[PDB]
Structures are given as structure tokens and as C-alpha cells.
UniProtKB/Swiss-Prot annotation:
It comes from Homo sapiens. It is found in: Nucleus; Cytoplasm. Belongs to the peptidase C19 family. USP16 subfamily. This is Ubiquitin carboxyl-terminal hydrolase 16. The lineage of its organism: Eukaryota, Metazoa, Chordata, Craniata, Vertebrata. It is linked to A chromosomal aberration involving USP16 is a cause of Chronic myelomonocytic leukemia. Inversion inv(21) (q21;q22) with RUNX1/AML1.
Amino acid sequence: PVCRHIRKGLEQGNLKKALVNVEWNICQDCKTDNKVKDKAEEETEEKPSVWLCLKCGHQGCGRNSQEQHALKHYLTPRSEPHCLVLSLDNWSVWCYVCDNEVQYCSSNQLGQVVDYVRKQAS
Ligand SMILES: [Zn+2]
Ligand SMILES: [Zn+2]
Ligand SMILES: [Zn+2]
């Protein structure tokens, strides 16, 4: 019928707090990578896909990046799955644990939040 990992991958409460002064379309995990000096290699001026964890508001870069930090975040061993990311590109949802693209509606929390987060980033 739908994905049932909604709550498992979407946590509205911590979303609100994350998106407050969050950076939009900016994989924060790129920025928080103090290891390197660049975190944005101006010579290439990259703009990868940006997937936002619907679970915590962690913004990562998807497949179109070298790091694919969004997936690293999924592959991160943790108690909650955080397996829901929405694309700031096509506004799709990806559920890593479903391993497909998720669809939602107006009564579905995922849709509600995507709508909300879209209002955030808008
Ligand atoms: Zn990144
Ligand atoms: Zn997360
Ligand atoms: Zn799912």
C-alpha cells in the first residue's frame, strides 16, 4: 500500500529544529567535513544531488557526488534507520530500506512533511 517505515524514517519533531537555521541544498555533511580545506572544490564548482534525511534533517549529497554522504549516513550503524531522504532536486523520496522511490499523499505524514520541508527550503 505504502511504505510503513514512515515514522522510522521521518521524525517531525527533530525536523522542525533542524530546518530552522539549516542550510538548504547544502549537504551539511560536506561542510562539516573539517578534514579538508575545500568542502567545495571551486575548481570544479560542483552541485551534486542533495538528499535530506526526513528523519533528522541531515542533508547529504546523493549519487551525484563523490562522497554520496546521504548513503554513508544510511550506512552509518545507528539505532534508528534514518532511511528516508527526500531529494532537493526532483522532490522525490527515497527509502533505502525499501530500496525504491517513495510516494506519498496529503494524509500521509511523508507527504505532509515533504510539503512542510518544501515550505522550509522554498
Ligand atoms: Zn556531502
Ligand atoms: Zn538522519
Ligand atoms: Zn520504506
